[PDB]
Scaffold this active site. Sequence first.
Site, mmCIF file in Angstrom:
data_model
loop_
_atom_site.group_PDB
_atom_site.id
_atom_site.type_symbol
_atom_site.label_atom_id
_atom_site.label_comp_id
_atom_site.label_asym_id
_atom_site.label_seq_id
_atom_site.Cartn_x
_atom_site.Cartn_y
_atom_site.Cartn_z
ATOM 1 N N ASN A 69 -1.319 -26.592 5.216
ATOM 2 C CA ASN A 69 -0.331 -25.656 4.687
ATOM 3 C C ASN A 69 -0.910 -24.901 3.495
ATOM 4 O OD1 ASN A 69 -0.275 -28.179 3.266
ATOM 5 N ND2 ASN A 69 1.565 -27.495 2.204
ATOM 6 N N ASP A 111 -2.419 -32.017 7.747
ATOM 7 C CA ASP A 111 -2.887 -32.183 6.370
ATOM 8 C C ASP A 111 -2.013 -31.282 5.514
ATOM 9 O OD1 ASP A 111 -4.142 -32.698 4.037
ATOM 10 O OD2 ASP A 111 -6.031 -31.740 4.552
ATOM 11 N N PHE A 112 -0.784 -31.728 5.269
ATOM 12 C CA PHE A 112 0.157 -30.988 4.430
ATOM 13 C C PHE A 112 0.186 -31.640 3.054
ATOM 14 C CE2 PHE A 112 3.352 -28.813 7.486
ATOM 15 C CZ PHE A 112 2.324 -28.209 8.175
ATOM 16 N N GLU A 113 -0.317 -30.919 2.062
ATOM 17 C CA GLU A 113 -0.390 -31.418 0.705
ATOM 18 C C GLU A 113 0.538 -30.573 -0.160
ATOM 19 O OE1 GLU A 113 -4.419 -32.453 -0.476
ATOM 20 O OE2 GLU A 113 -4.969 -32.747 1.628
ATOM 21 N N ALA A 114 0.954 -31.145 -1.289
ATOM 22 C CA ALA A 114 1.934 -30.510 -2.158
ATOM 23 C C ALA A 114 3.287 -30.359 -1.464
ATOM 24 C CB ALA A 114 1.429 -29.169 -2.698
#
Length: 317
Positions: A69, A111-114
């Site tokens: 993202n 791989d969704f970070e934050a």
Amino acid sequence: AAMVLAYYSGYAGNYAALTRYAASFNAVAVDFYNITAQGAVTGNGDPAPNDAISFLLGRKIPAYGCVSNVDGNGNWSADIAHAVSTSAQSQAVANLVKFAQDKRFSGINVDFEAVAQGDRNNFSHFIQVLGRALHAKGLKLIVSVPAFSAKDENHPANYGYDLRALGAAADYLQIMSYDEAIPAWDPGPVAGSDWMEDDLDYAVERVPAAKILNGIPAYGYDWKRPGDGGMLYWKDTQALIARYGAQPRYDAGTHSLTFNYGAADGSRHTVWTENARSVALKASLVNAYGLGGTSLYALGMEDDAFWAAVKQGLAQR
Ligand SMILES: [Cl-]
């Protein structure tokens, strides 16, 4: 039959390492893709890794499309994760499935970070729906999550990740048990074993251990001073020690290597990184916990001794 998941991402030497080390890893996360707030999968600005995908298909090594993202500026986007998990969920799920089919991937690595803390349940629901959709096509789902334990599970950075819910839906959680310290913060172990074990204890209470991968960095950090530092690849550690004639100290309590040096500009640097003993120890946690395997970040940062240490640790019973 542990999974040994290598990350193929935008680093120099990535393809050389992919091909050199393909007897050492047995799955690859192909980290070349973003998703938009409307749920469309795109490239990430780097050239399409079609050569890497072809190599892995020929070697019968499962490849996962690793989709992030990240917005058009290269920044992690809580807004994209929110949109994909809510208004664009049906598009995103279908598009991720078709993307895996189109590329002959064995699955998707989300791989969704934050992810925003307010999106905890939205994100869990997205992963539930996505996992069912991938499974209906014989595909797998790996979700990369930050590494933490109970004391920090309600921190704004971590509350968006409900490991119990995510782990029930996915085939694996890729626990990013690195970046315990980063350049923006004070120096310290990047993947300390005490912190890692706390994180794994937390994870395996909530998720079947066979669905957990730990994470091992092929890098450390070199701080000029707190808040001011840079990445030091595994393959560059020995040269840096030699440049300054440093005497590195093995911190047994965290299974981490540290050293200092005085730079020409007068600053006193502090490095925290790995050595062969620490990598083998961290890989051996697969057997200690009954994990599904390990994950290594990332191809192009390492040399032969890194993978020898992974192999050694995985064989330690
Ligand atoms: Cl940073």
